[PDB]
Ligand SMILES: Nc1ncnc2c1ncn2[C@@H]1O[C@H](CSCC[C@H](N)C(=O)O)[C@@H](O)[C@H]1O
Ligand SMILES: Nc1ncnc2c1ncn2[C@@H]1O[C@H](CSCC[C@H](N)C(=O)O)[C@@H](O)[C@H]1O
Ligand SMILES: [Zn+2]
Ligand SMILES: [Zn+2]
């Protein structure tokens with residue numbers, strides 16, 4: 078209402094659109110809106126951090142793109158686009174009679190996909206992917222000191238790495254370390270789900286010393302299992318995401334388990350004065366709470382780096398990485414082995430309409446004039462796992478897909494773990 | 505139903521009552537029931553930990569005493585007794601025709617207060633307060649190593665104590681340290697509520713250095729504010745208790761703030777090899793979750809000690825204390841200054857119906873001039889062992905000031921806990 082009055086005042090050329098927050102009509106303009114023209118208040122920044130990468134079961138966005146709220150949204154008909162524009166924002170930026178006439182338009186493209194690009198009150202700002210990448214470096218509200226850079230040990234003095242992996246899953250971290258050719262002295266890995274235990278047991282040939290519950294693990298265990306050189310882990314993102322229909326809480330269950338990672342990180346950290354190279358990685362999903370993200374950034378004492386897997390793989394897997402691994406910030410490079418098109422990951426006899434899959438038009442494959450799910454071995458190919466990685470035991474397809482989806486993106490974790498070759502021995 | 509068939513088999517003398525779990529009828533009998541005769545399964549132990557000290561707005565118990573569940577409970581008419589027995593348990597242990605006839609009895613006592621104390625299928629075990637005290641030493645499910653005992657520093661080498669207090673409130677901890685006569689070098693205190701800030705500012709004469717929110721305190725702040733010798737804290741129990749009608753969550757809000765205490769504890773802890781005496785106390789309420797209590801015990805790496813203030817003061821203020829303060833286990837001694845009766849804590853011209861008041865239709869506890877009346881604010885200060893007129897600082901309402909008093913630690917309990925710190929730090 079106040080939004081709409083302010084945009085009415087703007088169309089008279091009495092107020093600049095860049096001096097007003099186009100999301101909620103707030104005068105407290107600190108930022109500029111990254112995609113479109115207007116200002117941006119800080120409450121709308123927190124709402125934009127929480128809500129922008131939230132998608133319904135549909136596959137399309139949970140809320141509007143402009144204000145991250147709205148009442149009734151307008152879904153885009155363009156292929157591979159999932160954006161939604163609520164009716165209240167289109168009443169402003171396009172006009173109060175053009176939303177109703179644009180609903181009647183059956184092939185309707187949204188304004189991020191509009192072939193023309195320019196409109197009367199709304200124009201699309203040009204370097205919007207660059208500003209979307211800079212928008213997460215814009216999160217300087219949590220200001221910290223940079224992670225301590227340790228000087229590289231000489232190549233003759235390097236030793237095999239020792240990894241404490243919490244929330245191991247299907248042993249993605251050890252698989253990536255072997256893919257880099259780093260010698261692994263030992264790989265301690267706590268995990269509870271039997272199927273993921275079994276995947277790692279078979280695929281890594283009994284090298285992994287499997288552990289009980291993380292909460293059961295104490296500091297004495299951490300001391301007696303040798304000094305650790307790399308401590309990795311990722312919080313469960315089954316309840317933390319908006320994709321699960323059963324969102325009874327947000328940081329019941331999953332948050333607890335984060336604090337378990339926090340405690341065993343301190344337990345594995347060498348003392349001050351012990352200048353031996355130690356490293357740690359935490360992972361979480363982007364569709365998360367702001368105060369959640371703050372509390373995580375404060376406890377781990379570090380700024381999160383967002384890394385989307387689209388730059389290197391065929392999925393849309395945007396994940397926050399806290400850590401002190403050198404070159405965590407540096408831009409991602411996709412090797413020729415990595416498949417950037419979904420069609421390359423498909424089996425033979427199958428053709429994909431999509432170029433990317435949003436796993437967080439339900440079934441993404443046209444085969445034999447019929448709509449079908451990605452097969453399990455294809456999902457393995459999509460994240461960059463080796464072929465037939467999860468065919469170990471006699472488990473169902475629904476469970477095995479669910480076992481694959483939770484996992485870290487393999488070229489992303491390769492990109493992250495790659496400078497550790499400078500610090501430890503090679504095969 | 506099954507448990508009712510089980511009790512039927514017990515009254516035929518085919519099964520012992522001590523081989524069955526009288527709460528829910530489970531055959532997995534690990535423990536014995538502490539108050540009455542029968543076994544006790546572990547799930548019922550967890551339900552007993554959570555539910556036993558939960559009281560309604562009535563003042564009486566939230567659930568049945570026997571099974572911690574039940575459907576419709578029977579409240580006890582005896583004075584100062586707040587127990588409830590659900591109809592389904594009395595169908596067994598007294599008989600299926602005696603519950604109905606015992607409702608009709610208008611002066612009805614319960615079976616922990618029964619003059620006879622010996623009924624047909626239900627008898628009362630004799631050393632039940634001893635077994636209630638031992639029942640919290642029976643919580644060895646969370647087994648840990650004992651807290652490290654540091655050897656005492658000589659009396660000529662002692663220095664004034666430095667306290668980092670989180671969730672200070674009305675500065676109970678510094679007041680108790682001054683009551684003991686310990687020299688305090690500095691008292692940093694984080695606190696958000698203005699009224700509790702103000703109480704501390706006036707009652708402790710600007711000595712307290714006040715911080716903003718606990719979530720704004722970094723490790724850099726902990727390093728630059730001097731080494732700390734004693735870190736204390738207590739989580740909010742407004743939402744965590746069952747007394748608040750608005751229980752939307754359990755460890756939303758309050759749970760966070762616990763971890764803030766956890767982090768700043770690690771930030772204030774000296775390194776390994778730095779053998780200087782460092783101490784810490786955390787406090788929480790007893791009407792809490794089991795897995796909650798587990799997670800807290802695991803993070804703080806210690807076994808809780810339940811301490812009820814009834815042993816030293818006029819309230820029932822049963823609280824868990826985690827810590828490494830020496831003699832945290834040892835039994836409580838009530839000095840002659842402490843008032844064990846409620847009547848002594850009353851003003852003149854007022855006479856109490858109760859001997860103890862616990863506040864987390866006899867809702868108002870005082871019979872004055874043929875009329876029922878709340879405890880006055882200065883009396884609530886006397887009940888917890890605060891000095892007289894402790895909270896009369898600023899122009900604040902009575903409801904707010906009572907609410908400001910009720911959250912606070914019990915002063916002779918905290919005196920009992922802090923007392924061996926005199927052996928480690930300087931005196932006035
Ligand atoms: N208490 C607990 N201890 C260990 N693992 C747990 C756990 N609770 C859940 N998990 C498991 O931890 C995972 C959360 S996220 C797993 C991602 C992992 N990096 C991978 O690539 O597979 C799930 O597999 C979940 O089943
Ligand atoms: N984030 C926060 N930082 C500091 N204090 C807080 C807080 N949230 C709540 N509090 C306060 O902490 C107290 C919780 S319990 C206070 C008991 C205290 N030992 C005493 O004797 O007063 C309440 O006074 C509450 O208002
Ligand atoms: Zn706004
Ligand atoms: Zn909108």
Ligand SMILES: [Zn+2]
Pocket residue numbers: 153154155158159160186187188189190191
């Ligand atoms: Zn579009």
Ligand SMILES: [Zn+2]
Pocket residue numbers: 525526527528529530544545546547548
């Ligand atoms: Zn039972």
Ligand SMILES: [Zn+2]
Pocket residue numbers: 568569570571572573574589590591592593
């Ligand atoms: Zn009962």
Ligand SMILES: [Zn+2]
Pocket residue numbers: 580581582585586587613614615616617618
């Ligand atoms: Zn009674």
